[PDB]
C-alpha cells in the first residue's frame, strides 16, 4: 500500500485531491496540510510515501528544494494549471517524480501515483517541448 500526503491552502481542493483517491484501495490518505509550516513539523513524524502538492502553498520550488535535501526517501507529485514549459523544465530539475495538471488532474492524479510505485516518473504529454529543445 502507499501512503499520500496532500498538501494545499485550499479545502475542497484537498477534498478533491483525497475523494479522488478514495475508491483506490491500495492507497491509505495520511495527512491534508493547508501550509508549508504544519507539512513541514509533520514530515519527521509521519512514514508517508507521495506529497501531492500544488508550487503556491517561486516560493513552491523553495519549499519542494527544501524537502528534497532533508526528505529525500518522500516523492512529491506536482499539480499545476500551467503547462509553460519554462515553469515545468525549472520543475524536473529539483528531480521530483510525477507531474499532474490541475485541467483534469482528478482523473491522471491515480495513473500518476500507480507511475510512481512501480519505480516510473510521471511527465506529462508537453514533455515533447522539453523533448524537441
Same mark, same amino acid.
Given at each position: 500500500?502507499?501512503?499520500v500526503? @496532500?498538501?494545499?491552502?485550499?479545502?475542497?481542493?484537498?477534498? &478533491?485531491?483525497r475523494?479522488?483517491?478514495?475508491?483506490?484501495?491500495?492507497v491509505?490518505?495520511?495527512?491534508?496540510?493547508?501550509?508549508?509550516?504544519? +507539512?513541514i513539523?509533520?514530515?519527521?513524524?509521519?512514514?508517508?510515501h507521495?506529497?501531492?502538492?500544488?508550487?503556491?502553498?517561486?516560493?513552491? @520550488?523553495?519549499?519542494? =528544494?527544501? @524537502? =528534497?535535501?532533508?526528505?529525500?526517501?518522500?516523492?512529491?507529485i506536482?499539480?499545476?494549471?500551467?503547462?509553460?514549459?519554462?515553469?515545468?523544465?525549472?520543475?524536473?530539475?529539483?528531480? @521530483?517524480?510525477?507531474?499532474? +495538471?490541475?485541467? &483534469?488532474?482528478?482523473?491522471?492524479?491515480? =495513473?500518476?501515483?500507480?507511475?510512481?510505485? =512501480?519505480g516510473?516518473?510521471?511527465?506529462?504529454?508537453?514533455?515533447?517541448? +522539453?523533448?524537441?529543445?
Open positions: 500500500n502507499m501512503n500526503i @496532500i498538501a494545499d491552502d485550499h479545502p475542497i481542493v484537498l477534498f &478533491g485531491i475523494k479522488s483517491l478514495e475508491q483506490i484501495e491500495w491509505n490518505v495520511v495527512g491534508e496540510f493547508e501550509d508549508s509550516t504544519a +507539512l513539523n509533520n514530515l519527521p513524524k509521519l512514514d508517508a507521495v506529497l501531492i502538492t500544488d508550487l503556491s502553498m517561486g516560493d513552491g @520550488i523553495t519549499l519542494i =528544494k527544501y @524537502i =528534497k535535501r532533508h526528505f529525500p526517501s518522500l516523492s512529491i506536482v499539480l499545476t494549471m500551467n503547462n509553460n514549459p519554462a515553469i515545468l523544465s525549472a520543475v524536473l530539475d529539483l528531480d @521530483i517524480e510525477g507531474i499532474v +495538471l490541475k485541467q &483534469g488532474a482528478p482523473t491522471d492524479l491515480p =495513473k500518476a501515483l500507480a507511475a510512481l510505485q =512501480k516510473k516518473k510521471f511527465t506529462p504529454e508537453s514533455v515533447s517541448r +522539453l523533448l524537441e529543445k
